[PDB]
């Protein structure tokens, strides 16, 4: 169901290539008919309000997307009804039999793994979750037990669910023992490093996301190529420039992606530029991959040019080590810069110490300043020191 | 024994005035007695506290860092106390179930 979320995604609010709109709408109406799913048609009503781009043409002209109705209607919510009333009967046909036979803890569990497929398949999220609750307690082992986790995971991802989700995850992790099992391996570091995204935790997320297994791809929830999508994106911070050119450049994973998906190019244009630290090249790269890239993916859209920011920070730092004083025209005719547009750009760090460059007004020139000393590292210890002291004070006299 | 018979810097202080009146009254005595190897060790120690104050700017570098090691010192020393008064306070849930 990676299609089906994806889709979904792209005529919230695309500001490029309006085109793919087209195909996102006859994709999720043609599979939405395929399917069991009755609400998931409903929900484009009200999931669309309020956003650029609208998909809903009723009472609002200002729709800007090449398939304009996504009006719900009873024609297809009739049809999607017989089918699941249809099911349900076959599934209570058989669960009535399992339960006049009562063989072991695992005919009794199937009984609620059909149902927990079931309700999630019919649109069904809070009366899936009372389903899976049966079948993992009667569970015969910990296979049967994370099958439970897989359908928690599928609702969660599409509603963006970080607290039921996130409790039922580590609790397959943690358990009574977890050992080298793949799939409380693969499978979590993948969901829990897709959670980590959402709240851009970047600790575990280049260490979960560019290092991957193998291929990952179960293709039920995320692809293969989505994988190696926010790969490019969260390799950019954690990772410094020693593993860009072990885990990212001269990672065998991402030599074969060129020759086969051409619509990313976050692992060539952008590695590339920053490892050779040219500006001029990596200027332009930027909107290229911020429109095919940040826009249509869910998990980055939702910020987008806040990492315009960030991405352009790391890049500022390059050359900040490799020069001491400079003019500003220099890097103007080189790197193909604007100086009259260059103090706003570097107006947003260095005020807030992000950066240490230092610009001479008078000739025109940049300096640099210290990058690191004694000082500035205690002053975390401050911050840090008198944040702890307000737990004492107010778990002190609140026990008394 | 001796534990049978009978049972920092302040004391240093004092010992340190201790030797310098023993120098006191050697150079009031000698004035007298007039008008060598201590004065040639003498006017080594003057040499060798007006000269300390050059290095006070490099002095104040570790000496910070004693109030870092006792500021995470403090830190820990709740640690000992709030732990205590958690378990004095499943002492009086004790006592009164009693």
């Known amino acids: ?400 | 024994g001796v534990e049978h018979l009978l049972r920092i810097r302040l004391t240093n202080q004092l010992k340190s005035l201790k030797g310098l009146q023993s120098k006191l009254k050697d150079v009031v005595e000698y004035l007298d007695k007039v008008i060598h190897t201590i004065l040639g060790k003498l006017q080594d120690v003057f040499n060798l506290n007006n000269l300390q104050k050059a290095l006070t700017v490099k002095t104040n570098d570790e000496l910070m860092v004693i109030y870092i090691s006792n500021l995470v010192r403090s830190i820990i020393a709740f640690d000992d106390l709030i732990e205590n008064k958690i378990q004095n306070k499943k002492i009086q849930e004790q006592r009164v179930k009693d």
């Open chain 1, 1 to 400: 169901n990676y299609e089906v979320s994806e889709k979904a995604f792209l005529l919230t609010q695309s500001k490029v290539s309006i085109e793919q709109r087209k195909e996102a709408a006859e994709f999720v109406l043609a599979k939405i008919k395929e399917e069991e799913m009755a609400p998931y048609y409903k929900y484009l009503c009200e999931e669309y309000l309020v956003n650029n781009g609208q998909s809903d043409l009723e009472h609002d002209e200002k729709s800007d997307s090449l398939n304009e109705w996504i009006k719900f209607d009873q024609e297809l919510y009739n049809e999607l009804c017989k089918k699941n009333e249809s099911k349900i009967k076959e599934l209570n046909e058989k669960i009535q039999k399992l339960e006049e036979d009562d063989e072991g803890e695992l005919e009794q569990a199937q009984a609620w793994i059909n149902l927990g497929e079931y309700y999630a398949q019919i649109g069904d999220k809070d009366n899936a979750e009372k389903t899976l609750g049966k079948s993992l307690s009667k569970a015969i082992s910990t296979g049967a037990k994370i099958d439970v986790m897989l359908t928690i995971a599928r609702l969660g991802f599409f509603y963006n669910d970080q607290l039921y989700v996130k409790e039922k995850l580590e609790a397959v992790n943690s358990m009574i023992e977890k050992g080298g099992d793949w799939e409380r391996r693969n499978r979590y570091k993948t969901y829990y490093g897709i959670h980590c995204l959402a709240v851009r935790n970047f600790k575990e997320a280049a260490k979960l996301l560019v290092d991957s297994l193998a291929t990952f791809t179960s293709i039920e929830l995320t692809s293969y190529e989505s994988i190696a999508t926010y790969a490019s994106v969260t390799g950019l911070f954690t990772l410094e420039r020693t593993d860009l050119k072990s885990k990212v450049i001269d990672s065998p994973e991402l030599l074969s992606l060129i020759s086969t998906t051409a619509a990313l190019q976050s692992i060539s244009s952008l590695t590339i530029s920053l490892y050779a630290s040219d500006y001029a090249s990596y200027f332009p790269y930027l909107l290229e991959t911020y429109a095919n890239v940040l826009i249509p993916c869910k998990y980055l859209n939702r910020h987008a040019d806040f990492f315009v920011r960030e991405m352009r920070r790391k890049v500022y730092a390059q050359l900040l080590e490799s020069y001491k004083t400079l003019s500003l025209k220099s890097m103007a005719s080189a790197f193909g810069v604007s100086v009259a547009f260059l103090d706003n750009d570097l107006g947003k760090f260095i005020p807030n110490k992000q950066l240490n460059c230092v610009i001479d007004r008078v000739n025109g020139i940049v300096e640099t300043n210290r990058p690191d000393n004694k000082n500035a590292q205690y002053h975390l210890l401050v911050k840090q020191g008198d944040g702890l002291l307000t737990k004492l004070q107010k778990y002190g006299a609140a026990v008394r």
